[model samples]
Target: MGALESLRGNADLAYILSMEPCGHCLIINNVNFCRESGLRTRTGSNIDCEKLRRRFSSLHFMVEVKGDLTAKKMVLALLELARQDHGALDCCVVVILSHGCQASHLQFPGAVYGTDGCPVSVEKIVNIFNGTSCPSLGGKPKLFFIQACGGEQKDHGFEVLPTPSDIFVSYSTFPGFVSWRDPKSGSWYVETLDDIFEQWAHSEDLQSLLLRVANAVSVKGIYKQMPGCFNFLRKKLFFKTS
Candidate 1:
């Protein structure tokens, strides 16, 4: 069971999102309406989108880039992306790049969209691909790469943890540390991850690759943002780089 499973030979798809718009969620008389956040533009995300598309494509993932998505669209996007008949694919991967908040919550687009500056829980994205919710991707490897801040806190990493069974997540920063971005270059987490994925995705498994990326993020930045992955994959997953 511990074989080198590949995505290169399969017709799997990956969605890379650059959700950098002001999706507004407003309330009147207890009624919520979507509007705008008056937020600053996330400039370098396009760079991330481009790089991810190129590399993930090389690994045989049909990549689509969506920018400036709102909360409704973001949630629906995850579901819509999963709605396809995954029976023919090897895996499903979703990459989210946005302004996130504490407690695994990303930013809201408008009024309270995914919750920005309202606070949307990141778990919704994961639940969409659950065995009960989206049966099509039931047994498949649902990979989620989240490039956002978990909180304003720092992770001293008090304890070791056990890995999971199916869902795999590649988070950019620790639970409390804020993720960094260069309006000119792109996000530190994603850039480092892309570089490693491009070079080692073929030869190495994801767990090892992500660990290397975690260290690389620290090496490349003075702020010390650590990349992490929660792996539930029973066997090794190699993106069929060959």
Candidate 2:
């Protein structure tokens, strides 16, 4: 059986977390505001955290990070949630949707005001899940779909990037550009994400799906109005529980 089929009878959970605030926050339409457009909450196709969580009562959980969650709190919460005991369930998935800078700085409230700001690093997250504290996720697939900008300007362009292995990281723009969103619609990163995940969930493997997501974001996601569109990924990841 395929990975999706393998997950069918087992308790597999998909978590969707979104935060809509950042330093130098921009005024968005429906949801909250951030440097970029807020999480794509308005898309009729988007899945609410609660509804997505209900899919697997035994092992699935959905989380949304909205309006300026601090870096420390974000890491602590993820560690706590992943450490929860589900008994014999060896694998888990966590998704983070938020506004991030090129330096991997997570945008917190007052970042622009210079009062309070924090950044959650990729290394910190990896260390937390590497050892005994969260053994369930150890050596298991961990996917992080980051819909943020990786640079300060919009002029920087793509440079024949290499594909990431194991733990994959996806971005909304290439580098040094701003990701675009319609004040009326939402973010291009997420809009493409929802569609890609929906189609790939039942069909392809994680790597294939993510590569496609990267391509789509690089090509269609970048435009004159919205630049700095790209994705970054690392590590080899798989979802298997049999």
Candidate 3:
């Protein structure tokens, strides 16, 4: 109660988060891929999906989970979301679980694969909700939690303020490293994120909570991993439990 009480007087520094069912949360979980993609089935992604669904739901986000979509379909889904009226909501969240690889081009650094073996730039995904395309969400927080391999390289350790504004992007691993996952459990990044969110989302700002998530995930898995984030939020973002 002490910590939550502290946040009460600090409203000016954080985004307004009082809406019931705070905002829409979209979960794009891609478990299977076409043979041409050469990507293996993401066995434990459903666990991550279910955990996130419950977690976001508990935080009063209206959750929608979509699985096994093509690249075009992914865009279409996000376009549909962008087209929705977000004027009454406090913020929006998007969680993507899939196989990812290094970007083929310069503009797109983090590229996740669609079930059909096509690539969708994470940047493009985030931009769908930008002020221009989705004006209803203007000045509101748009959080993206991306759980996928950044590249073939493995992370041993270690480490967007200007953009579309009020957007936060969390990548599972460093820019050129592979994110680790266990078939029996789930991704190290996702599992730890869920745990950290459960413990602190109520009291901590989104930036601090994500740092905790990075620290928690860094020590996990057979190989070390370091989560990364791009914070373009103009103000602190918090998830209200009630």
TM-score of each: 0.74, 0.57, 0.92
List the pairs of residues colliding in candidate 3: none
Candidate 2 deviates by what RMSD?
Answer: 9.8
Residue by residue across 109-221, what tens digits does model 2's lDDT show?
Answer: 11111002444554455445554655554434444544454444664446451222234344455544555654444566666555666666445555566667666766653
**How accurate locally is residue 41 in candidate 3, as Cα lDDT from 0 to 100?**
98
lDDT of each: 0.61, 0.41, 0.86
Q: Candidate 1 at 197: error in angstroms?
A: 1.4
Which 10 consecutive positions of candidate 3 have the poorest summed lDDT?
155-164
Model 3 segments more than 4 A misplaced: 1-8, 104-108, 156-162
* Candidate 3 residue-wise lDDT at 178: 91
Name the lDDT of candidate 3.
0.86
**Residue 178 lDDT in candidate 1:** 72
- Please identify which of the two predictions, 1 or 3, would achieve the higher lDDT against the true structure: 3
Could you give candidate 1's per-residue lDDT for residues 27-62 as a string of tens digits?
111012234654456678778777876766666676
lDDT, candidate 1, equals 0.61
Q: Compare the candidates by lDDT and give the number of the best one.
A: 3
